[PDB]
């Protein structure tokens, strides 16, 4: 069989919840099936290297290579066309009085939630939950919300010693093997948790926003919106405030929208591979935070692998160390580069449809990789004709949206992906604008866009050649200071040193130290007299 | 006729001013304030010059005019006062002398005033903006109805809708007399009492256009744009015949049009400022005003200077200075000469920088400047302020707060409540001025960056820029220490420059009237790309 498994995982180290949740997940890749969907990592309110060249190998093979539809998953969607389930079903009210005692009972730091959809061959929640038990001490707490449209309940079980083998031997060939047992004490599902946590009903809505199961009485989206609608007229509490979305570039954390990160350009397009590592540590000094290089007579892989290389030694010469992305579409230039380790994200932009193959570099069976979706259409040379759009600024937004479900259906981690509407790219000046004067249509994504030097802001502004010029990056500037207002996550640029000026005085301005003195002492000047 | 009585008595008047020629508004209200000034006392009040909707339900001979008036028989007294007894009686509002005219009582005003409204309505309701401003003057004039004799005469010489005149309050007076008629002699008396008059067919004019007389005015309570203009002047004030001050009352109005009809009163009824003889909406474009410091031998350099920041695009030049006379003056003499060479309404707005008397005095008698820039404040030697006023001219002015001066004011930093200290400093200030009779709408607010203010009380201060939403505001970081120490070998120079144009962006998003800068080009530059971001094409 293969079933629709969607978890809930877990963890409390900050510094380390990418680390442990990312693993985590090539466990479940591995041991129950292929991950079609994950979440975005939230950040929540209520060694590990060397354990990976040496594990014990599923009894089933990894499919890496790519998938553009699943009809069990959408089966499940819809739902309910799969075969009984292989354990006792329960009924609406049998199921909604026994989860109340189970609360109540448990009634008597931060929290990272990380939902995730599997296909899945393990036969049962049980021996899913077994398979899972294993994960956790080979090791952070792994959930079960679902499996298929089952209204499962089970009161009691104890478990063998030989039994754990003989289930841990279905899927895996294989002084914890009992160590199991005082903790499965119970099988829910759907899981108790689901309505109340509002941290799992927050990764739902990011998966499976149109779901309705049976014995829930509103799709998970109508569910979301109404803890979120309500918590704020009952409570008067804004939830977002403490449940924060983040994304991930390399390995550490980032909240969504907290910041405007500088990536500074590189381009290598004779030329000269020691100066490019000058720049790229002159870059690093002047504030930025990313370098992306690209070269697009020889070779691309000939202008970057190298400076890659005379960087990743130099910088071993002298942890605050920059990102690394790599403006490329080319398989191959990035399958070294990454098989090297010489870089942290792929820039592409053609939103990876250049090579759909290139999104399989973006995982290994220990390692993730980020990725930044550029819209466009054509190429340099026709671009500037392919400039129809039915609604330009949500065709732009749907096409890259479209495109973060494929990668997400493959298990790219969504918080891994990137948006970026392209400017300049088969877009009128009027059409770069527009898309800009409505970026707040990405407020749930990251996003990350470039402007600099475009031509679209000489034209808002109607040695000669050299006024522009400077004028040019005059007007970048303002559009940094509209997307530090508008809260992008990544802006591309040539002049790093002017952009960082200009973001550290933006960012001081804002930097209040009491939010309420503002009022307070406008009061205390109308009482003085 | 005990109109004519010669009892010398002071009075306090509160006028309407109203116009419908929105490209000729500050020259139309600015003559008739030198005509108020001439012929009725003195001006003590005003409020801002405001864009109003119509509210009829409930070009050059000028210069001539001016050349040509008759002498008032009162004196004009430019000395500065500090305080106005007869203003303050006023607004308690207590003991003042008997009204020379009959009153009416409240029930009895109500009625005849309501009356006339229905009436008033009914005519217009069976069948272009207003520029409008209010005044108060310190008056000689006896009466109301003296009052509004003078005021016809000179709603008449400034003809050939061009301009109504309305007496507001006078004193504490509730009257209501329906039909006056004047004999043409009497008016002649009337008028030949406050002018040397030496104009006859305008005389026969006046009989037919006073009919009755209403105060207060019978549009007082009922027109938003009146209650907009004494709001500015006279918050607290409350009249016998009002329900409540003059703010319940404009507030009220506000929130009823929010209900019973969900307008927004406010986005139609727009508040002007006056840098030199235009209207600027308040609040509607950041200006970059460019700095030209004259710290020399060579003006001519100067001046090309001065001609490269225009074409960089700054519409105010900001002028500062061996005299400070002999650095500024010749620099501002050949620029007009290199001006006049030369296409007429590209030429900047002109403001000096300077707290000396003598040397605006020569720019302001040689047509040099527009602004002064008086970073005292006007505190430094207030007589300065009789130079912002001329016989047909009034000049704008910047006040900026300090204390001290450049080598003690780094110590001078102690403050209970920046930010609301500084602000009631500025306010004070324009009390001042406008009891001196300048213009509530030529005065821009500066909290002086830098001086008198640690880096962090300066960033504090511009955090809190929006507590300046309702005045027209002028700021100067450019290049200020503060900036640096803001974020982590010209380095310096330069990223000094680019805090700057994170400032452009601040201040252009909080809408601040005016940024003095040095980097005219590169500010231009910024502002130009916010606004495109901001230009939705639907
Ligand atoms: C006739 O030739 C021309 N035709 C069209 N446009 C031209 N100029 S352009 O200024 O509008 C312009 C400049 C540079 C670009 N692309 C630079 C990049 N932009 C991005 C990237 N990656 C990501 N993720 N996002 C990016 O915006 N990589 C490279 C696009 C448009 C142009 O002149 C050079
Ligand atoms: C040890 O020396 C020093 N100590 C403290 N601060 C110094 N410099 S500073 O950066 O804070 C600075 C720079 C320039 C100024 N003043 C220039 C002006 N500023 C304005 C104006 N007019 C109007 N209306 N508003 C204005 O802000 N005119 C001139 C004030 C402070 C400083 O260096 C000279
Ligand atoms: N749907 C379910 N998925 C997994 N375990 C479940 C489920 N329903 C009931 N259980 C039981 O509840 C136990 C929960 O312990 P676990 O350490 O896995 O953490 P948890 O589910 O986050 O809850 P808690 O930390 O409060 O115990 C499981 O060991 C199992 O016996
Ligand atoms: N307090 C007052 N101030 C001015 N005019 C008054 C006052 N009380 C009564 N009046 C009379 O109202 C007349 C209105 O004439 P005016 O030329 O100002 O017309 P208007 O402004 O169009 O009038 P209204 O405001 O009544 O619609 C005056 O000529 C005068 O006779
Ligand atoms: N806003 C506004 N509306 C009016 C005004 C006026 O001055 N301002 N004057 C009128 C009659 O003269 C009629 N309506
Ligand atoms: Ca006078
Ligand atoms: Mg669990
Ligand atoms: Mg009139
Ligand atoms: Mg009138």
């Not at 509490?237 to 924060?244: G, L, R, S």
């Not at 579409?329 to 090297?340: G, L, Q």
């Not at 340099?380 to 749907?398: A, C, F, R, S």
């Not at 997307?483 to 960012?507: A, G, N, Q």
Request: glycine residues 2%.
């Amino acid at each position: 069989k293969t079933n629709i498994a969607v978890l809930n995982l877990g963890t409390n180290d900050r510094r380390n919840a990418v680390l442990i949740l990312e693993t985590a997940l090539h466990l479940v890749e591995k041991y129950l099936g292929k991950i079609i969907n994950t979440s975005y990592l939230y950040e929540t309110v209520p060694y590990i290297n060397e354990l990976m060249q040496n594990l014990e190998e599923s009894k089933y093979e990894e499919n890496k290579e790519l998938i553009d539809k699943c009809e069990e998953y959408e089966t499940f969607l819809k739902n309910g066309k799969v075969d009984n389930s292989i354990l006792k079903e329960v009924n609406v009210e049998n199921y909604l009085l026994e989860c109340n005692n189970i609360i109540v009972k448990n009634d008597e730091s931060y929290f990272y939630n990380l939902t995730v959809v599997v296909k899945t061959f393990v036969n049962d929640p049980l021996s899913m939950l077994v398979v899972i038990k294993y994960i956790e001490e080979l090791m952070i707490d792994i959930d079960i919300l679902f499996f298929n449209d089952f209204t499962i309940f089970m009161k009691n079980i104890k478990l063998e010693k030989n039994m754990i083998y003989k289930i841990l031997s279905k899927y895996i060939h294989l002084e914890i093997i009992n160590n199991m047992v005082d903790n499965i004490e119970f099988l829910s599902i759907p899981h108790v948790y689901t309505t109340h946590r509002y941290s799992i009903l927050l990764c739902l809505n990011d998966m499976i926003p149109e779901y309705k199961h049976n014995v829930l009485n509103n799709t998970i989206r109508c569910l979301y919106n109404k803890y979120v609608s309500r918590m704020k007229e009952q409570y008067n509490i804004n939830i977002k405030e403490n449940n924060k979305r983040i994304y991930v570039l390399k390995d550490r954390i980032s909240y969504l929208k907290e910041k405007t990160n500088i990536v500074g350009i590189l381009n290598v397009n004779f030329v000269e591979p020691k100066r490019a590592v000058q720049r790229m540590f002159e870059m690093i000094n002047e504030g930025a935070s990313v370098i992306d290089i690209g070269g697009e007579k020889i070779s691309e892989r000939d202008l970057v692998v190298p400076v890659l290389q005379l960087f990743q030694k130099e910088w071993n010469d002298i942890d605050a160390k920059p990102i690394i992305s790599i403006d490329t579409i080319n398989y191959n230039v990035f399958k070294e580069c990454v098989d090297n380790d010489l870089v942290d994200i792929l820039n592409d932009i053609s939103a990876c449809t250049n090579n759909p193959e290139i999104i399989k570099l973006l995982k290994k069976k220990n390692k993730f990789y980020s990725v930044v979706l550029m819209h466009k259409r054509g190429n340099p040379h026709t671009m500037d004709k392919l400039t129809n759009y039915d609604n330009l600024v949500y065709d732009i937004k749907n096409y890259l949206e479209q495109r973060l479900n494929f990668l997400v259906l493959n298990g790219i981690p969504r918080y891994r992906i990137l948006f970026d509407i392209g400017l300049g790219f088969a877009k009128k000046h009027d059409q770069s604008i527009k898309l800009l004067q409505n970026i707040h249509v990405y407020d749930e994504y990251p996003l990350f866009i470039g402007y600099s030097r475009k031509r679209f802001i000489a034209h808002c502004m109607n040695d000669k050649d050299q006024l522009l010029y400077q004028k040019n990056i005059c007007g970048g500037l303002a559009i940094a200071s509209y997307s530090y207002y508008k809260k992008v996550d990544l802006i591309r640029v040539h002049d790093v040193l002017e952009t960082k000026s200009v973001l550290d005085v933006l960012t001081k301005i804002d930097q209040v130290k009491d939010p309420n003195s503002s009022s307070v002492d406008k009061l205390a000047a109308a009482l003085e007299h």
